[PDB]
Design an enzyme around this catalytic site. Structure first.
Site, mmCIF file in Angstrom:
data_model
loop_
_atom_site.group_PDB
_atom_site.id
_atom_site.type_symbol
_atom_site.label_atom_id
_atom_site.label_comp_id
_atom_site.label_asym_id
_atom_site.label_seq_id
_atom_site.Cartn_x
_atom_site.Cartn_y
_atom_site.Cartn_z
ATOM 1 N N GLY A 29 0.828 -1.149 0.000
ATOM 2 C CA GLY A 29 0.000 0.000 0.000
ATOM 3 C C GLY A 29 0.892 1.238 0.000
ATOM 4 O O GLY A 29 0.675 2.161 -0.806
ATOM 5 N N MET B 51 4.770 3.127 2.055
ATOM 6 C CA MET B 51 5.997 2.896 2.752
ATOM 7 C C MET B 51 6.495 4.153 3.430
ATOM 8 O O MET B 51 6.613 5.230 2.799
ATOM 9 C CB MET B 51 7.038 2.405 1.785
ATOM 10 C CG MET B 51 8.384 2.118 2.429
ATOM 11 S SD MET B 51 8.242 0.731 3.589
ATOM 12 C CE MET B 51 9.542 1.220 4.726
ATOM 13 N N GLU B 52 6.908 3.977 4.671
ATOM 14 C CA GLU B 52 7.248 5.093 5.556
ATOM 15 C C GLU B 52 8.672 5.646 5.499
ATOM 16 O O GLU B 52 9.258 6.113 6.520
ATOM 17 C CB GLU B 52 6.938 4.653 6.986
ATOM 18 C CG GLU B 52 7.862 3.582 7.553
ATOM 19 C CD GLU B 52 7.365 2.158 7.384
ATOM 20 O OE1 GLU B 52 6.527 1.875 6.491
ATOM 21 O OE2 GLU B 52 7.858 1.309 8.152
ATOM 22 N N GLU C 259 1.499 5.865 7.578
ATOM 23 C CA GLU C 259 2.876 6.085 7.203
ATOM 24 C C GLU C 259 3.419 7.286 7.999
ATOM 25 O O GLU C 259 4.505 7.230 8.444
ATOM 26 C CB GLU C 259 3.047 6.291 5.714
ATOM 27 C CG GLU C 259 2.428 5.208 4.806
ATOM 28 C CD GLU C 259 2.718 3.743 5.234
ATOM 29 O OE1 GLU C 259 3.735 3.522 5.949
ATOM 30 O OE2 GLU C 259 1.883 2.833 4.907
HETATM 31 N N1 DAB Z 1 3.548 -3.754 3.461
HETATM 32 C C1 DAB Z 1 3.465 -2.390 4.118
HETATM 33 C C2 DAB Z 1 4.865 -1.779 4.407
HETATM 34 C C3 DAB Z 1 4.964 -0.594 5.390
HETATM 35 N N2 DAB Z 1 6.129 -0.838 6.348
HETATM 36 C C4 DAB Z 1 3.638 -0.296 6.117
HETATM 37 O O1 DAB Z 1 3.498 -0.632 7.231
HETATM 38 O O2 DAB Z 1 2.561 0.284 5.604
HETATM 39 NA NA NA Z 2 9.686 2.037 10.087
HETATM 40 ZN ZN ZN Z 3 3.134 0.012 8.836
#
Ligand code: DAB
Ligand code: NA
Ligand code: ZN
Ligand code: NA
Ligand code: NA
Ligand code: NA
Ligand code: NA
Ligand code: NA
Ligand code: NA
Ligand code: NA
Length: 867
Positions: free
Chosen positions: A258, A260-261, A295
């Protein structure tokens, strides 16, 4: 042969990297990466440096500018011997973004280049310590063709820039916060940009930038609005401010997750950014809000405090999901949020916990880490944080948050660290509670009650057990917070007490078997049990129909009204699936229909609630009710139930539908609620007399002034197979084919159609102008929706569904194993099904098992399923 990794193997790294300077000479066919790292030995002096790397072409290795001879490449690694204690490592390597179909590392999205590094993607960019307990200060220089890539973005702030001969330019970025490399990002392309500002409560002005493809600026302002709402809520609720001067978001079409942070440079699937009232539903608007929040909330719960190793994933994800739920719930309808999160838990997560892929929220064993971004780690993880919040209360919960950041800011922490912070700050003992981190499967809580009129005592006898799962043969009792409420026969709450003292309404269900006695119960009570789904457990209590309808009429919390209606329906869902299997038609007592009639005509019920009660459990929630799943009986009972209520409630349904008409479209919670009630009614009205229904549905589609209303009509025409269906579906294709996000909704309707020839139609759609196997959204909307969301067709008795999926997975195993692994999930549930189905599902799985170049991602799942 891909090998499992174990949580108990964790060891501190032999080497750290403190600072890394990266240069990219960017090109789609051949990108040259130069990486200068400052390294420090922490382990034994004879330990070699072991760097991770995948599909890299190594050009050179230097240590303090000396060309190094003491190294070897091995499978997935570069092993460097005989090093000083501190030195500068320089690697030059090449990679090829255009060949990267798996969309991990540096790859191409349309004409853009972008990255995805979580979990282990950075090793596809250069040889590095690709583990999240190595935290380095990044500086990143990007060099590229100016006409093709006028924007060159990475984490942090711009510190340098220049122009070069032959139409090239460059930009250099510096992020002052040390980070694990999974938070690295790079984006190059040509975009429209919406620029705005957020001023933090202490007065820091943050520049906000949303990058979208040219032509998409009209779909950007809601996401910008939501980002500002996120930043404000985090200040108000958690006391947290953004810590940099610039916040970038890039929307890209080709993305496996969806969103990415990545620190200061989030990369989003454009499904979670782009909205306008004619393209996006209320549900899309609220998902955009949710995922933008999510995010953003990671900036603290994930970035400032990160994960020591990947088995601790839920430390950032269960917590950040909890945060996104609290954000959505505070801004919106708490009841509707909670309800939907419960439906996901019981309908999808309970299924995973009953599957071969079962694992605890902190896994012990993983082969492919990308297989563990799960309902369990995310959703059950959040239920676990929410149990902490239940046990501690908000004020102590926030103290534990504050102590967590004070202890762990700037480090990579563990789940156990977070629990310890909560326990130390609050003085609530969480030693037993820790078992929620280590044990998989869904507890089953059985409740029996007794009222004693001579003593005026109500006694609950509560018992628990968790069935064994394939991963764990031993199970032990959990610390279950079990919230109750007791009602007298006018619907007033009975104060809970014993021996003259108030008693907390959250019971501590810590044993296999215990009783709880309540005094001063003057009249026989009707209980509400497991209020607000206070723990993620199955509840076995033998409600009477009348107790349930009483709760629907009287329960103080909206959730409990909904939940009671779900328990009322469960009995009759089960009844009628057994009937369906013997050829018998639907049977429903009059008094059940009437309980929903009453909800329709109650003026005092919040429409947001009424709407959820009038949305029947999905086929996935219905499946949870059973040991063996009959997907055909469930789908047909669900439709039969819908038709029965449509007939018995026709007049009332039409009146409420008409009364909830809104000529103005607004994205505002009260409007959303009325619309959801209206469109709830519509689902049943679509099953009235064919000519009334066809006219009404068709009218709604053609007169809608927003996508919520148009899609609800289109979806009803599909569900009831109404005469207008084909024309409306063709009109939508004609109007919207050039728009992938909007065609995703149409692909889902095709895939989930009750039509007899659905599979035929879905196969033909692989050649549709708006479909392509190169885009994960399209794949998921057509194939993934058929397999996962039309279990009746996917499980057709001829086995045609399984063959089709095998065919799709045979392509995707090579192209994009992560999307492959998402799509295989329906096949791995084979032991929930009857023998004859199992046999064909096993045969499908054995075929996939024999694929040449079987990805690790599929291997792990296939191996568990076939055990
Ligand atoms: N698959 C999602 C990846 C990201 N680290 C999130 O938590 O939205
Ligand atoms: Na993180
Ligand atoms: Zn996440
Ligand atoms: Na470090
Ligand atoms: Na460099
Ligand atoms: Na190698
Ligand atoms: Na904030
Ligand atoms: Na609210
Ligand atoms: Na229920
Ligand atoms: Na289910």
């Amino acid at each position: 042969q891909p090998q499992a990794k174990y949580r108990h193997d964790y060891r501190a790294p032999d080497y750290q990297i403190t600072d890394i300077d990266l240069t990219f000479d960017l090109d789609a066919q051949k990108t040259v990466v130069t990486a200068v790292s400052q390294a420090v030995r922490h382990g034994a002096s004879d330990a070699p440096l072991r760097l991770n790397g995948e599909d890299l072409k190594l050009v050179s290795v230097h240590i303090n500018d000396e060309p190094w001879t003491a190294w070897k490449e091995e499978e997935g690694a570069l092993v460097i011997s005989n090093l000083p204690e501190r030195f500068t490592l320089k690697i030059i390597n090449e990679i090829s973004p255009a060949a990267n179909t798996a969309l991990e590392g540096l790859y191409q999205s349309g004409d853009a280049l972008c990255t995805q590094c979580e979990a282990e993607g950075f090793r596809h960019i250069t040889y590095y310590l690709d583990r999240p307990d190595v935290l380095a200060r990044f500086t990143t220089k990007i060099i590229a063709d100016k006409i093709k890539y006028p924007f060159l973005l990475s984490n942090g702030n711009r510190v340098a820039q220049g122009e070069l001969e032959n139409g090239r330019h460059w930009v250099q970025w510096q992020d002052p916060f040390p980070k694990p490399c999974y938070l690295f990002a790079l984006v190059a392309g040509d975009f429209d940009v919406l620029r705005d500002t957020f001023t933090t409560r202490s007065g820091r002005e943050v520049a906000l930038e949303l990058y979208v493809d040219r032509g998409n600026l009209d779909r950007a302002p809601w996401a910008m609005t939501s980002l500002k709402n996120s930043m404000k809520w985090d200040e108000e609720r958690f006391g947290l401010e953004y810590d940099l001067d610039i916040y970038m978001i890039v929307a890209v079409d080709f993305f496996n997750a969806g969103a990415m942070e990545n620190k200061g440079l989030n990369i989003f699937n454009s499904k979670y950014v782009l909205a306008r009232t004619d393209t996006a539903t209320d549900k899309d608007y609220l998902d955009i809000e949710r995922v933008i929040g999510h995010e953003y909330f990671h900036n603290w719960t994930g970035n400032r405090v990160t994960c020591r190793d990947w088995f601790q994933l839920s430390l950032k994800e269960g917590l950040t999901v909890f945060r996104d739920q609290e954000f959505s719930s505070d801004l919106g309808s708490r009841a509707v949020n909670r309800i939907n999160n419960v439906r996901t838990m019981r309908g999808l997560q309970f299924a995973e916990d009953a599957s071969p892929m079962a694992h605890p929220i902190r896994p012990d064993m993983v082969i492919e880490m990308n297989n563990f971004y799960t309902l369990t780690v995310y959703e059950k993880g959040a239920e676990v944080i929410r149990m902490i919040h239940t046990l501690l209360g908000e004020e102590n919960f926030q103290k534990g948050m504050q102590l967590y950041f004070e202890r762990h800011d700037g480090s990579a922490a563990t789940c156990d660290d977070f629990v310890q912070a909560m326990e130390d700050a609050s003085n609530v003992d969480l030693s037993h509670f820790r078992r929620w981190y280590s044990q998989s499967g869904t507890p089953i809580v059985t409740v029996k009650d007794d009222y004693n009129p001579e003593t005026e005592q109500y006694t609950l006898t509560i018992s628990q057990r968790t069935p064994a799962t394939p991963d764990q043969a031993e199970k032990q009792p959990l610390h279950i917070p079990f919230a109750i409420e007791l009602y007298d026969n006018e619907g007033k709450v009975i104060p809970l007490q014993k021996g003259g003292h108030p008693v907390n309404s959250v019971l501590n269900v810590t044993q296999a078997e215990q009783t709880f006695v309540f005094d001063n119960v003057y009249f026989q009570p009707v209980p509400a049990l497991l209020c607000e789904f206070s723990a993620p457990v199955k509840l076995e209590y033998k409600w009477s129909d009348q107790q349930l309808t009483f709760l629907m009429r009287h329960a103080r919390n909206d959730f409990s009204r909904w939940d009671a209606a779900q328990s009322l329906l469960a009995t009759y869902i089960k009844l009628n699936v057994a009937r369906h299997q013997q050829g018998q038609p639907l049977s429903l007592p009059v008094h059940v229909a009437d309980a929903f009639r009453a909800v329709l005509l109650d003026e005092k019920i919040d429409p947001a609630l009424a709407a959820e009660i009038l949305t029947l459990p999905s086929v996935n929630e219905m499946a949870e009710l059973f040991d063996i799943i009959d997907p055909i009986a469930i789908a047909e009972v669900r439709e039969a139930l819908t038709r029965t209520l449509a007939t018995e409630l026709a007049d009332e349904l039409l009146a409420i539908y008409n009364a909830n008409y809104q000529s103005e479209y607004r994205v505002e919670h009260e409007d959303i609620a009325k619309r959801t009630l209206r469109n709830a009614c519509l689902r049943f009205l679509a099953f009235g007399e064919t000519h009334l229904a066809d006219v009404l549905v068709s009218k709604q589609f053609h007169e809608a002034n927003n996508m919520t209303d148009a899609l609800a009509a289109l979806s009803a025409a599909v569900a009831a197979q109404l005469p207008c269906r084909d024309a409306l579906m063709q009109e939508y294709d004609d109007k919207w084919h050039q728009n992938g996000l909007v065609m995703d909704k149409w692909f889902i309707l095709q895939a989930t159609s009750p039509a007899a020839n659905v599979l035929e139609t879905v196969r033909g759609l692989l050649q549709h102008r708006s479909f392509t196997m190169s885009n994960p959204n399209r794949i998921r909307s057509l194939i993934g929706a058929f397999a996962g969301s039309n279990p009746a067709a996917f499980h057709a008795e001829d086995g045609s569904g399984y063959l089709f999926l095998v065919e799709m997975l045979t392509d995707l195993n090579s192209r994009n194993p992560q999307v492959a692994s998402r799509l295989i999930e329906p096949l791995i549930r084979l032991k929930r099904y009857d023998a004859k189905r199992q046999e064909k599902m096993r045969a499908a799985l054995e075929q996939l098992k024999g694929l040449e170049n079987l990805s690790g991602d599929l291997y792990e799942k296939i191996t568990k399923a076939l055990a």
